Amino acid sequence: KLVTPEDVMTISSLEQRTLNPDLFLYKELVKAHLGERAASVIGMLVALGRLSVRELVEKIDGMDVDSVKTTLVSLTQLRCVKYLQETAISGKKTTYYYYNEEGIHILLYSGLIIDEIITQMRVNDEEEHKQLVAEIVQNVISLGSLTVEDYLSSVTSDSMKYTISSLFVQLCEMGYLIQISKLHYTPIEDLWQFLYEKHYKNIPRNSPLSDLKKRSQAKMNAKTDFAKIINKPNELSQILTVDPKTSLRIVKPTVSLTINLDRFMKGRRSKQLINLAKTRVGSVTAQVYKIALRLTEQKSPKIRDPLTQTGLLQDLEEAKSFQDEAELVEEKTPGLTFNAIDLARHLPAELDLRGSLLSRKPHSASLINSHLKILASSNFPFLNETKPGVYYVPYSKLMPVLKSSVYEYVIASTLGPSAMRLSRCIRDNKLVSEKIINSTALMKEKDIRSTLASLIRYNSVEIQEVPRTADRSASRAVFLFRCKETHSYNFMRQNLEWNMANLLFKKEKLKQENSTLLKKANRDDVKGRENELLLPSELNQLKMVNERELNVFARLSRLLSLWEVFQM
Amino acid sequence: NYMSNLPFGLGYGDVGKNHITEFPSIPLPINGPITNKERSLAVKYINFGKTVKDGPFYTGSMTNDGIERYSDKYLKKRKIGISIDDHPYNLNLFPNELYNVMGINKKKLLAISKFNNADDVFT
Amino acid sequence: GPWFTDGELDIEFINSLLTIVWRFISENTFPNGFKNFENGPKKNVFYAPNVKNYSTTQEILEFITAAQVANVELTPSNIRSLCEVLVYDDKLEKVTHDCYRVTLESILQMNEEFSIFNYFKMFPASKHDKEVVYFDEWTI
């Protein structure tokens, strides 16, 4: 029957379709975890860019200076707001607050981070380290950054304190917890601008070098100083302190530790690559690839090069330099190359490798070498050979393949396998016509037209109009089709962000609607005795609400597995 | 007339309605049933959201009558909650203009939550 | 080619021909076609890297000629074009010119942690579920 605009505005998501996915997602996450004041501040910073305290006061109605300062403190402690202090020519000093995706992604990835921490260090054997690792990582994420002495001040058992200290050392060794500093609070672009201007001024005046030579020298000095500053967190400078009693390595007491997002995203990329390899080369070979990626994960290249966020890509030579540098670091890093002998010690007891191969139609080195050669000889560049018997993961060449495969399979799952066929057909030969599509891809012409019309709506296929008249009339022109990767990838990344934000919005609306029953059920005496202390109708409503919330979070996790590929 | 010319594929019967739905019909495969690992991940999400909800950094939304009764005694106080100025801040990470509201010289307590081992969500 | 019937493609003949070609290449590349994949996840074997598991164009042409399904002559360009149709579907992959090999995903498609590639195993959501994620949304 007919649906009224009242029903459309009520039961559908038409009002939320007009919101930017970045702003909507960040505001929903901050409003879900922190309060509405922090949500207003984050939303205003996203909408207007960097702002001062005075500007935030004058732009948001209902907040004064003290309230804005308090919520800025709350956001800064959880690392949701970056800041920069700058001095004007007149001498006035002003602090400008930004937003960083790092803290909001920490809020978004929190349970996934806890699960990755729990699984990664092989504490799967027993229970007490499961408790301690989970509680310390949850406290670190919830409080933003905490010192070890302040954490241990709340523990009275000496053995428990020793185990907590050892676990903190174990986390710090493998890169998951790093030292927080002002580097994590200053913007990358501002840091590079400061370094570039400093190295530009240090060039002597009336130099024989021209303007471009001065710019190139300043860029080189800024790049090496920036690389040193960026890599300074990862030098393990907070662990060198030994305890007053001998034979024990401890993290420094007064240092402030924080969760490292880059290492977690490296783990997520490793999981995505394992999932991709599980669809091309076997299951035992997938296990070998999994162990190889877990071994060479801490020293692996970062997910995003920070120099790419400095606005330096306007020069084509800088783009080629970045690509060549990435290809160099993914290969010549000492910890990235590996052999079969290196992987022989890390194989599990259950893994056998014995009868997995047929040559003609106990963790030995030859079997591992055969599996890695299968990985390296596959169509997808899972591994590459520098010298024979030495293998390394080609992160520069493997990740566009992963993005394309994930994108094509999402289109296959949503719009159909014929959509995959049409997209890959238009991709393989770059610019095609309808007749060339019909000849090359063997399917009906009307199906071709309908499928490409559906694909055009999602930036998958772009129409190139070639006019044959003085006026570009559609009747006389000829329409070819091309497939641009970047437009489609950006569009689907935005779509997945909007879906995640809409899911969180629905969850928050459901909780706000059932707030009375959830507050009654979560009370200390009520909890653990819900059957005894609650009516059957309230019990059934609690049943449905908790099931819906669990389904929301499961779909959020599945979306996050599908969305981080386009953030790589 | 503006009505005479029709495309070859279409006919007069199938055109002239213009019913574009406001409701989508193409679902992602992520809407399947939940598993055990996903259930543990979801209860980790819920636990983290709850432990940030009641933490020292919340900054929430922006019958305590003035009448005095003898029932005020024998009535307990609700909660001595931790405030924004009762946290051991690292002052090197904060701007100088925020020092006034953090209580730089006050009592310092670290609110450490305890992990809930069991998936206490009632199914 | 012979695909044109009364001026349009015959999709049933296309599907049958593509299926028989894909099954032949699947029999070539794996040790036993659709045999090791029964009771698959525990006991499944693959060829060594030095083994020439790829099936060339000439073998496919000879097999489809002896099969007598096409009922007409087949130019190597025609079998190459339909194998390109297959590689567009991600059923197989090309490693060398006039050489093809069946991908493992197509083998898994005919019949745990979430992945996008094994989407056929996922079940649709039940009706009257409000918190269901749509790909068409944000564009409708």
Q: What is the DSSP secondary structure assignment for residue A549, as one 8-state letter?
A: H
DSSP structure class, residue A506? H
Chain C CB contacts of A409 under 8 Å are: 116-117, 119
Give dist(CA B118, CA A134) in Å, integer: 12
Terminal-to-terminal C-alpha distance of chain B: 64
Q: Is residue A139 classed exposed, middle or buried when 0-12, 13-18 and 19+ CB atoms within 10 A define those classes?
A: buried
A370 CB neighbours in chain C (<8 A) are 48-49
CA atoms of A323 and A396, how far apart (whole Å): 8
CA angle (B92 as vertex; B86, B96 as ends), nearest 5? 80
Contacts of A490 (CB under 8 A, 6+ apart): A459, A566
**A463 three-state secondary structure:** strand
A181 contacts: CB under 8 Å, gap ≥ 6: A233, B92, B93
The closest alpha carbon to B84, from A179, A67, A107, belongs to A67
Q: Quick one: tokens of A446?
A: 């009307």
Secondary structure of residue A565 in the 3-state scheme: coil
State the chains in contact with A (3 or more Cβ–Cβ pairs under 8 Å): B, C
Residues of A in contact with C6 (CB under 8 A): none
- Report the gap between the CA of C66 and the closest CA in chain A (Å): 23
**Alpha carbon distance C47, A360 (integer Å):** 7
Identify the H or E element spanning A454. Answer: helix A445-456
- Using alpha carbons, select from C67, C54, C61, C65 the residue that is nearest to residue C27: C54
In this structure, are residues A96 and A84 in contact, taking their beta carbons and an 8 Å threshold? yes
Locate A94 and state its tokens. Answer: 């002003």
Query: What are the residues facing A242 on neighbouring strands?
Result: A249
Question: Rounded to an integer, what distance in angstroms lies between the CA atom of residue B81 and that of residue A262?
Answer: 35
Nearest to C125 among B23, B24, B27 (CB): B27
- Identify whether the C-beta of residue A342 lies closer than 8 Å to the C-beta of residue A354: no
Angle at B71 between CA B68 and CA B72, to 5 degrees: 60
DSSP chain B: ---S---SS--STT-S-----SS---B-GGGS---HHHHHHHHHHHHHHHHHHTSS---------S---GGGTT---------TTSS---GGGS-GGGTTTTTSSS-----------S--S--
Q: Spell out which residues of chain B touch residue A78, defining contact as CB-CB under 8 Å.
A: 57
Residue linked to tokens 């530790």: A257
* Spatial separation of the C-alpha atoms in residues A264 and A274, rounded to whole Å: 15
Put simply, the answer to whether B29 touches C116 (Cβ < 8 Å) is: yes
The C-alpha atoms of residue C75 and residue C65 are separated, in whole angstroms, by 11
Phi, psi angles (nearest 5°) of residue A432 = -135, 160
The two structure tokens encoding residue A26: 């960040």
Asked if B121 and A546 come within 8 Å (Cβ–Cβ), the reply is yes
Backbone angles phi, psi at C54, to 5 degrees: -70, 145
Q: CA-CA distances (angstroms) from residue A385 to A214, A274, A326?
A: 40, 19, 17
Using a CB-CB cut-off of 8 Å, the residues of chain B touching A182 are: 92-93
Could C135 and A562 be called an inter-chain contact, meaning their C-beta atoms sit closer than 8 Å?
A: no
Q: State the Cα angle at A290 between A289 and A296, rounded to 5°.
A: 85
Q: Which of A143, A151, A138, A156 is nearest to A251 (CA)?
A: A151
Which of chain A's residues have a Cβ under 8 Å away from the Cβ of C104?
Answer: 279-282
Interface touch A370/C31, C-beta < 8 Å: no
Bridge-based pairing of strands A93-97 and A83-87 is: antiparallel
For residues A498 and A492, what is the distance between their CA atoms, to the nearest angstrom?
A: 10
Q: How far is CA A511 from CA A38, A519, A545, B55, C125, in A?
A: 19, 10, 8, 19, 22
Q: How far is CA B5 from CA B10, B11, B16, in A?
A: 11, 10, 13
Q: What are the C-alpha distances in Å from A395 to residues A155, A261, A383, C84?
A: 44, 19, 9, 28
**Coil, strand or helix at A525:** coil
Among candidates B45, B59, B108 on the partner chain, residue whose Cβ is nearest the Cβ of A111: B45
Q: Structure tokens of C22?
A: 């894909």
Instruction: State the structure-solving technique.
Output: cryo-EM
Other CB atoms within 10 A of residue B16 CB: 7
In 3D, which of A159, A162, A131 has the Cα closest to residue A148? A162
Q: Which helix (H) or strand (E) holds A453?
A: helix A445-456
Instruction: Name the strand (E) or helix (H) holding A86.
Output: strand A83-87
Amino acid at the residue A2: L
**Amino acid of residue A388:** P
Query: How far apart, in whole angstroms, are the C-alpha atoms of residue A26 and residue A391?
Result: 41
Q: C99 CB near a chain A CB, below 8 Å? A: no
Angle between helices A261-277 and A395-415 (to 10 degrees): 70
CA triplet A333, A248, A342: central angle to 5 degrees? 30
Can you name the residues that pair with C8 across neighbouring β-strands?
C5
Least Cα distance to A563 among B115, B30, C95, C112 occurs for B30
Q: Is A353 left (phi over 0), alpha (psi -120 to 50) or beta?
A: left
Note whether B91 and A81 are within 8 A (CB): no
Nearest to A184 by CA among A326, A277, A81, A104: A81
E strand residue ranges, A402-477 = 462-466
Helix residue ranges, H only, A50-173:
53-59, 65-77, 101-108, 110-120, 128-143, 148-152, 158-173
The span from the CA of A514 to the CA of A512, in Å, is 6
Contact A485, A559 (CB under 8 A): no
Written as one string, the DSSP assignment of A201-228 is: HTSPTT-SS-HHHHHHHHHHHHHHHHHH
Q: Are B102 and B85 in contact (CB under 8 A)?
A: yes
Q: What is the DSSP letter of A567?
A: T
Structure-token pair, residue A451: 């499928």
Measured in degrees and rounded to the nearest 5, phi and psi for residue A185 equal -110, -10
Q: Give the minimum alpha-carbon distance from C138 to chain B in angstroms, rounded to a whole number.
A: 9
The DSSP-derived string for A123-157 is -TT-SHHHHHHHHHHHHHHHHSEEEHHHHHTT---
User: Is B81 at the interface with chain A, CB within 8 A?
Assistant: no
Cβ distance A267 to A120 under 8 Å? yes
- Please state, in angstroms and rounded to a whole number, the distance separating the CA atoms of residues A309 and A61: 33
Residue A482, strand partner residues: A462
Phi, psi of A438, rounded to the nearest 5 degrees? -65, -40
Please spell the DSSP secondary structure of A246-301, one letter per residue: SS-B---SSPEEEE-HHHHHHHHHHHHHHHHHTTTS-SHHHHHHHHHHHHTSTTSP
